[PDB]
Amino acid sequence: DRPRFSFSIAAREGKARTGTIEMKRGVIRTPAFMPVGTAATVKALKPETVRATGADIILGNTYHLMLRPGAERIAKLGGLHSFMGWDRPILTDSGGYQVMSLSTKQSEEGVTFKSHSRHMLSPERSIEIQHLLGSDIVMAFDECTPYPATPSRAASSMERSMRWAKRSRDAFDSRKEQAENAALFGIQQGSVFENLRQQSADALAEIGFDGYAVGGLAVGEGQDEMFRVLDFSVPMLPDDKPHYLMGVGKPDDIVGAVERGIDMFDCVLPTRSGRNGQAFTWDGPINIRNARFSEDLKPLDSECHCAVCQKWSRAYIHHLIRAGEILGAMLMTEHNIAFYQQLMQKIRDSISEGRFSQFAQDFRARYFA
Amino acid sequence: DRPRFSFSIAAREGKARTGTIEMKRGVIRTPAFMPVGTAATVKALKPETVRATGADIILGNTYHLMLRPGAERIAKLGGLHSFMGWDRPILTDSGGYQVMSLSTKQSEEGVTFKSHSRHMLSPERSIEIQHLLGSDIVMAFDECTPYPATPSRAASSMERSMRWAKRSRDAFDSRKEQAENAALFGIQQGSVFENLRQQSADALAEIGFDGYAVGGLAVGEGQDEMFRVLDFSVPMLPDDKPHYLMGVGKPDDIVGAVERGIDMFDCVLPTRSGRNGQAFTWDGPINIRNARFSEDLKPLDSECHCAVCQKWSRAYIHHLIRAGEILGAMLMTEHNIAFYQQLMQKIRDSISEGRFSQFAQDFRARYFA
Ligand SMILES: CNc1nc2cc(C(N)=O)ccc2[nH]1
Ligand SMILES: CNc1nc2cc(C(N)=O)ccc2[nH]1
Ligand SMILES: [Cl-]
Numbered sequence A, B: 001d002r003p004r005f006s007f008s009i010a011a012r013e014g015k016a017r018t019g020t021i022e023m024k025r026g027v028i029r030t031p032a033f034m035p036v037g038t039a040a041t042v043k044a045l046k047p048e049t050v051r052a053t054g055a056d057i058i059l060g061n062t063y064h065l066m067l068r069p070g071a072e073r074i075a076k077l078g079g080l081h082s083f084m085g086w087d088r089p090i091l092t093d094s095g096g097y098q099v100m101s102l103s104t105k106q107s108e109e110g111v112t113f114k115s116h117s118r119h120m121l122s123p124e125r126s127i128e129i130q131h132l133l134g135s136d137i138v139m140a141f142d143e144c145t146p147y148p149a150t151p152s153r154a155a156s157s158m159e160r161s162m163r164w165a166k167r168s169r170d171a172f173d174s175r176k177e178q179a180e181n182a183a184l185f186g187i188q189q190g191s192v193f194e195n196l197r198q199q200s201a202d203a204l205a206e207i208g209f210d211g212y213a214v215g216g217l218a219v220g221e222g223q224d225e226m227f228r229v230l231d232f233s234v235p236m237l238p239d240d241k242p243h244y245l246m247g248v249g250k251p252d253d254i255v256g257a258v259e260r261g262i263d264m265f266d267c268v269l270p271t272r273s274g275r276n277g278q279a280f281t282w283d284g285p286i287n288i289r290n291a292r293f294s295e296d297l298k299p300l301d302s303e304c305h306c307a308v309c310q311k312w313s314r315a316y317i318h319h320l321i322r323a324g325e326i327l328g329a330m331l332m333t334e335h336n337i338a339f340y341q342q343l344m345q346k347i348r349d350s351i352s353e354g355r356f357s358q359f360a361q362d363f364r365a366r367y368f369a
C-alpha cells in the first residue's frame, strides 16, 4: 500500500524536476496540472472524463464548498471523493484567497464574511473544513497580499500568514485521522520582495510542511515580474519537497514556471475559457466563435490526441458554442483539459530525457508564431 | 446489407405491436422512443451516451437547423450524421409545427416567416432541406391544426395538408438519392373529428408512404381526449406500416398510446424537464431540487440500470442542479433518456411475451401510487 506522502525526484534539468508524489489515493506525476473542481465538479466533465484526459489530482475550493453544499453535509454524505465520484487525490485550497476575492472583517483570529449569511474562517476552521471534505492535500490558511503592496504591508501580511501557518500545522497535527492520511502544504508570501520571500521560506521550513506553495503571484503583476519573483523565491524552498504555484496559468506561464522549479499548478483558464469559446492549440489559442471556423472541418488541434479532436470538427463546435449548447461547453472543456495534460506530459518526458530547454524553446516558437 | 426500409411486426397483443424497422444506417426496435436533437445535439449528451442509453434513432428539427447552422452548410460539411457524430438513423420533422410555434404568412404555396431574417418553407423546400441534412426518415410538410378547431377550419387545414402530402411525396420521389436511401412518412390530420381523420387516412394511403404519423395531438387537448382520438384514428392507418405519434409524451401517455397501436414517439420532456430538475422514476417523477433530497444517498431511481444511478446520489445531483452546474444537466438528462429507453424495452418485452396489458396495469398502479 502507498504511503501517506512520498515525493521522489526521478530526473532534473537545470531547476526543472520531474517525479512522483505517492499518496494513499494515488500517484501524482510531476510537474502536475490540477483541473479545478470549484463546487464539487470540474465544470462540464464527469470525473471519468477528467481522468481520461490524464489528470492525477484535482483541486477543490474550500470557500465554495463550505457555503454550498456545506462541509458538515459533505462529511455526513461520506466525504467529497464519494460525493462527486472522484476517488483519486484532491487538493483543497484553504479559502483565504477566495474569501477576499468573492465575499469581510479581518483580524488576527481569522476572517468573518458574508456569503455572495455570515460565516467565519480561521486557520483552525479552514483545516477542519478540509478534514470534513476528506482532502488529501490540505493547504494552510493564509492571507494573499494584494498587488501592488508596499513593503510594510507586504511584511505585515506575510508575518500574519506565518503565524497562521503554525496554527494550521498544529490544527492539522491535532486531528489524528487527518495527520495520518493527508498531507499539509505551507504557503510562501512576501509579495515581490526578496527579503520577505526569504523570511517566509525560513519560517515555513522551520515549521515543516509536506510541500510548499508560492502564494501571492498571478495577482496582476504580469509574467515578467512573476518570473523575476520565481527566480529568487523557488530556490528558497526545500529542494526535496514539491513546489506549488497557485493559480497559474497560461501554457507559457507553466513552461517558464517549470524552468524555475515549480512542480504543481492549478488554474480555471482551461475550463472557464473553454466554456467561453477559447481552445488551446500548439499554434496558440483560438476563439472557436470566430466566423472563420464555421466551415472548418479540422479538429480543434491538429496533433491533440483527445476524444474531441478524434471525433468532432471546429465547424461543429463553433455551431454549438454560438448556439449556447451545453455540449459545446463539454467538448471545449474536455479538449482544453486534455491539452493541458498533454503539455504536462511533454514537460515530464522532456525533463526525463534532458531536452526540456529545447522543448521550451520549440514550444514558444510555435505557440507564439 | 440492410434495405432502405423494412418494417416487420414480430408480436402483437390487442392493438399493440412490437417489431423492427430495418434501414441502411441501422435497426430501430419498436415501439421506439426518439430523443430530440433540436440544434444538431441531444442537449447535454454526447452521441455515444445517447446510444449507451439504448436509443436506436434520434429526431432532428428542420426548422432550427435551417436557421442555424443552415441546411446548405450542413450538406457542405458532409451531412447531419457526420456533423454531430451520430451514425444511426435520424428522423427529421418537416418544420411545419415549429414554424407556427416559434416564428408568419401562410398560403397554399407554403409559409413565409421571420426567424426568432425572412425565410420560406414549402413542401418542396422542406423535403430539400431534409435531403441536405441527410435525414433517414423524412416527414411530409403539413399544417398542425391548433386546438380547439372548428370542424370547418379542421377540414380546410386537413385538406391543405393532404395536398401538401402529395407535393411532399413527389418532391421526395424526384430526388433519386433521397428516394433510394431514405423513407418518407405522411402525417394524418383532422383535429378530434373522426370523419376528417378517416378522410386524411384515406388520402395518405392513396398516395402511399413508408409510415404514418398521427399529427395534431398533444396540442392542449388532454390525455382523455388524445386517447379517444387515437382509439378511432390509429385503426384507419395501414396496419403493416409504422404509426408515429408526434410530440408524445409522458410515460403514461406512451403506454396508453402503445395500447392503441402507436409504434414511435418523440418528446422533449426527458431532456428539457431533466435540465429543470425533474427526474423520472418507476414511482413517478420527482423534482430533485426539493430540499428533501439534500441528504438522500439513494440513486435517482432504485431499479434504473443507467450509469448515473450506478454512480451518483440524489444528494449530489440535487446540489448540482441547485448550483446551476452543467454536470447536473448532463446527469439528469442521461438518466431521463435511459429511463425512457428502459420503459420502451419493458413495453417491447411485455408485448413479445403476451403480458403487456398486465405490464400497463402494474406500471400505472406504481407510477401513480
Ligand atoms: C489566479 N491567481 C491566483 N493567485 C493566487 C494566490 C493564492 C495565495 N493563497 O497566495 C491563492 C490562489 C491564487 N490564484
Ligand atoms: C408537443 N406536441 C406536439 N404535437 C405535434 C404535432 C405535430 C404535427 N405535425 O401535427 C408535430 C409536432 C408536435 N408536437
Ligand atoms: Cl472553471
Ligand SMILES: [Cl-]
Pocket (backbone or CB within 6 Å): B036, B038, B043, B268, B271, B272
Ligand atoms: Cl430538449
Ligand SMILES: [Zn+2]
Pocket (backbone or CB within 6 Å): A300, A301, A304, A305, A306, A307, A308, A309, A310, A335, A336, A338, A339
Ligand atoms: Zn483535443
Ligand SMILES: [Zn+2]
Pocket (backbone or CB within 6 Å): B300, B301, B304, B305, B306, B307, B308, B309, B310, B335, B336, B338, B339
Ligand atoms: Zn438512472
